[PDB]
RNA sequence: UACCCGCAGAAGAAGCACCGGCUAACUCCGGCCAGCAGCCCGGUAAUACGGAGGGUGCAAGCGUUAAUCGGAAUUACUGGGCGUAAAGCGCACGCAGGCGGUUUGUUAAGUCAGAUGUGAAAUCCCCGGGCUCAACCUGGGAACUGCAUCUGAUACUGG
RNA sequence: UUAGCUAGUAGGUGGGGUAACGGCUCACCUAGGCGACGAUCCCUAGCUGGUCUGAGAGGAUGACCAGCCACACUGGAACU
């Protein structure tokens, strides 16, 4: 029962000796809500058959993220091609301040307080990747606390 | 002179008087030296409308500063009262 | 830059240069009429755009636009312009309609306000 | 106890007074580098006790010419 | 010519942890010893000895968890070319109090939490994340 | 400064009932609700980010029928507010006179309420409150005054309030045609078809 | 005068912009002309011109123009770059300037801590109060991120 | 795309002058003073609390209200 969502579709042409072929590309993401997310992105030269195939992809090649209690544990910077992305933990009732792309993985992945911010091109594709990268980057008090071998007294 | 007197601050026909120790050129809402109480004259007897510290005024006072009327007759209803 | 490069030399903000200096950071201008005269668009379009010369009371001699369909203006008019460019090079003013010389245009149901039509009682 | 500044010497030409540099340290107000300022004033000096070089302690006082209004106090390092 | 020593041994812990290294090693100096100091008490690293009298050698036992680096980022904050010095409260917390700086307060060289304890600020060595 | 045209058509378009009508029929037995207005009605477009929080925006100030200065000053206070935006700003869009008045009975609809209140026919705390935006606090006592107990606008009101569902935070006298505001509803209270996130998003963009 | 009371009768009171995308809102009718255009239509079935119907958004206002900031991380201190997109002086020596290996002692200039004085009132923000509500007025507080002085700290920078 | 500026100019002694210190003024003597941390020159401009905007840092701005300054047809001057 996980969220599925469009962010954006794109009609990309490749030239023949005949002429252009008029081909569709989709970005999607889905995410189960706690934690998980995943994108997928698939070109057919059809819309439907684009998204399905972006709906495939996407439910296979999901990444798990360390929420806290429905925000991110630090503010984190995601950096693909690009775009450079900004994401910072709120209080709760702000909701998602975020572009496009950037609500749509924060919200399908369980984040519900977020200040986030896109730097340098806004690329929805290379967007999903900096976020993607950057949310899985991010770790929890309990990752550190192991990590150091002392307690979790820091949290 | 320095004298003590009111600033009319407030709205319109809904005056609300400061009790200001100011040197007696400048204008009313002026340069003043110490705002020492106010007076609310449309006050709803629920409220207050009267807390002009009697302590630096009697302090001013022994310095020569003068008591414009109406602030001595809210220095008469202060005393009376409290 | 460094950080000494700056201290030595700050960072000089862009100035950003007006895209209406005849109006001189006011809304309108009024002006008399110049010349009045017609203008081809520049490539893609194909039409004869109703232009006009006017020389505003600050002594700026500007071409401005003169939109909607049919005008009464002659030499020696003395209209009131405003920003608002033409995408006809070099035109970089719009004639308000309805402002002191130029007439509202007629027959005008919707949108009246931008070109100066009373209200058509019933 | 009294309030005072601490400079060197940087002139000693004229006649019962030297003119000190008072160098101070202060952080740029945008760029935040710590940046060296330095203020240079008339001292009165008399007897002519304070060469070029010296690191000395002035006060101020009242106005002593168009531009002396700096006296001075002690002398700490002597131009050497 | 060499005129940050302290950037010099951050860049030093990063480039061996990133090239998978056991242990660096560089010259040795009490500031550099201090915040090794102040690395090892958090659990950064592993363990440092310094060897040698004329020349002392600084020798800092790297340290990883699941094959990764313990150390995912360190930087040099303060620098000759710029110092940052902060107030007890405006002392930085990095990774959101996950991560420590290094703060050199007038009680020494200590983590920024240490600082704010003690309620000291100072200049801001590094942040080790 | 008040919508007078039709009603109805306001609920077709935002595709759910606004209560805009009394209530002496359904809504389906009125107007074609699951069809959008106009000639072009019949079709459903796609709605944008954009469309889906305008359209929760116009349904919430078209439900409480207040316009657009109001509601962007409420919101405004509720940003402003400690707490969640959402939930203080459906209990500020609550507190309102001419909505306690509806919710209490004495108005089939809030216009009629409204007309109730505005006409100085409403007393709280026994001083006539004219005031549509007039916000209620806790402990109010809002009634009818002397002079307009005797109207059957307020009698058929009654009765099809009490058609309705109660309000918990309500209680309410239909004989002597007065009420008490007890407390603010919390979010749990009011209905449940109201994302107040969408205009959270749609007023912090 | 505010405010209150009585009378009569829906009676005296709705407009402006927009509907190709950005951007909420679509159909009919009249030839690259007339015209529109904030940035990317019209050469004879134009959701882009003009009119009508319908709808959308605001509403005693609605639009256009002018102006500032934002978006613009597009002067990047926070917070950018320079092989080929704009950008490494043709190369070097070198004064002023910027920075500077390591240890000890000392100073306490930078730095840090505490206190005092000041930082006018209004304004901004918080909790209340009075105007039938609001705007508005107002009590108290917080704030005024600053400067100076005095007393200490000595890790780092400086002498 | 303004680099040199300054002769009462910088300082000292003495006389005068002011309510008051002071080249404020005068006589004489010394030869200095300002400047690349931008002197001099040129253009623009009342300053501040504040206002607008901005997450902030900043950017723009200085109408109303309050404090300070300057002016009173233009130039000069003193009297009370």
Request: with cysteine; hydrophobic share 35%.
């Amino acid at each position: 029962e996980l969220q599925e969502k469009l962010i954006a579709v794109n009609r990309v042409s490749k030239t023949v000796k005949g002429g252009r072929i008029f081909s569709f590309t989709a970005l999607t993401v889905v995410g189960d809500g706690n934690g998980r997310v995943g994108f997928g992105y698939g070109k057919a030269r059809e819309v439907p058959a684009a998204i399905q195939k972006a709906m495939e992809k996407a439910r296979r090649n999901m990444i798990n993220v360390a929420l806290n209690n429905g925000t991110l544990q630090h503010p984190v910077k995601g950096v693909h091609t690009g775009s450079r992305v900004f994401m910072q933990p709120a209080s709760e009732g702000t909701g998602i301040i975020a572009g496009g792309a950037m609500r749509a993985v924060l919200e399908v992945a369980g984040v519900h307080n977020v200040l986030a911010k896109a730097y340098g091109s806004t690329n929805p594709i290379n967007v999903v990747r900096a976020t993607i990268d950057g949310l899985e980057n991010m770790n929890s008090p309990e990752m550190v606390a192991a990590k150091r071998g002392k307690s979790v007294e820091e949290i | 002179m320095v004298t003590i007197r009111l600033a009319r601050h407030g709205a319109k026909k809904r005056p609300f008087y400061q009790v200001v120790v100011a040197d007696s050129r400048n204008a009313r809402n002026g340069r003043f030296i110490e705002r020492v109480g106010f007076f609310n004259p449309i006050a709803s007897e629920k409220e207050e409308g009267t807390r002009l510290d009697l302590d630096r005024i009697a302090h001013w006072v022994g310095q020569g500063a003068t008591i414009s009327d109406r602030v001595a007759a809210l220095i008469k209803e202060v005393n009376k009262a409290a | 830059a460094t950080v000494n490069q700056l201290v030595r030399k700050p960072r000089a903000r862009k100035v950003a240069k007006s895209n209406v200096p005849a109006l001189e950071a006011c809304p309108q201008k009024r002006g008399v009429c110049t010349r009045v005269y017609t203008t081809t668009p520049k490539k893609p379009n194909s039409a004869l755009r109703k232009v006009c010369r006017v020389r505003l009371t600050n002594g700026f001699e500007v071409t401005s636009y003169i939109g909607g369909e049919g005008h009464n203006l002659q030499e020696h008019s003395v209209i009131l312009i405003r920003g608002g460019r033409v995408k006809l090079p070099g035109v970089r003013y719009h004639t308000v309609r309805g402002a002191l010389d130029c007439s509202g245009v007629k027959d005008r149901k919707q949108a009246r306000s931008k070109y100066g039509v009373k209200r058509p009682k019933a | 106890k009294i309030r005072t500044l601490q400079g060197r010497v940087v002139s000693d030409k004229m006649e019962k007074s030297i003119v000190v540099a008072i160098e101070r340290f202060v952080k740029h107000p945008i760029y935040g580098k710590f940046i060296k300022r330095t203020t240079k004033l008339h001292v009165h000096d008399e007897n002519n006790e304070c060469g070029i070089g010296d690191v000395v302690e002035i006060r101020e006082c009242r106005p002593l010419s168009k531009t002396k209004s700096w006296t001075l106090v002690r002398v700490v390092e002597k131009a050497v | 010519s060499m005129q940050d020593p302290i950037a010099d041994m951050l860049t030093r812990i990063r480039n061996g942890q990133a090239a998978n290294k056991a242990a660096v090693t560089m010259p040795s100096s009490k500031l550099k010893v201090a915040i090794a100091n102040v690395l090892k008490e958090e659990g950064f690293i592993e363990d440092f000895k310094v060897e040698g009298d004329t020349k002392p050698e600084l020798e800092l036992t790297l340290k990883y968890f699941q094959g990764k680096a313990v150390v995912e980022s360190i930087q040099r904050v303060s620098r000759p070319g710029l110092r940052i010095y902060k107030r007890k409260d405006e002392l930085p917390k990095v990774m959101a109090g996950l991560g420590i700086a290094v703060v050199s307060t007038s009680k020494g060289v200590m983590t920024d939490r240490a600082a704010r304890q003690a309620g000291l600020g100072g200049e801001i060595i590094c942040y080790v994340a | 400064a008040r919508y007078l045209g039709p009603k109805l058509k306001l609920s077709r378009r935002e595709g759910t009932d606004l209560f805009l009508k009394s209530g002496v029929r359904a809504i389906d037995t009125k107007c074609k609700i699951e069809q959008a207005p106009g000639q072009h009605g019949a079709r459903k477009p796609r709605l944008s980010d954009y469309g889906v929080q305008l359209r929760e925006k116009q349904k919430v100030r078209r439900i409480y029928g207040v316009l657009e200065r109001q509601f962007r000053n409420y919101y405004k206070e509720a940003a402003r507010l400690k707490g969640n935006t959402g939930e203080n700003l459906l209990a500020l869009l609550e507190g309102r006179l001419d909505n306690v008045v509806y919710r209490m009975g004495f108005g089939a609809t809030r216009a009629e309420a409204r007309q109730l209140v505005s006409h100085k026919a409403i007393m709280v705390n026994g001083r006539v409150v004219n005031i549509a935006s007039y916000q209620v606090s806790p402990n109010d006592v809002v009634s009818i005054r002397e002079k307009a107990k005797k109207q059957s606008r307020v009698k058929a009101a009654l009765e099809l309030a009490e058609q309705r569902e109660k309000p918990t935070w309500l209680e309410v006298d239909a004989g002597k045609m007065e009420g008490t505001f007890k407390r603010k509803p919390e979010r749990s209270d009011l209905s449940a078809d109201i994302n107040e996130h969408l205009i959270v998003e749609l007023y912090s963009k």
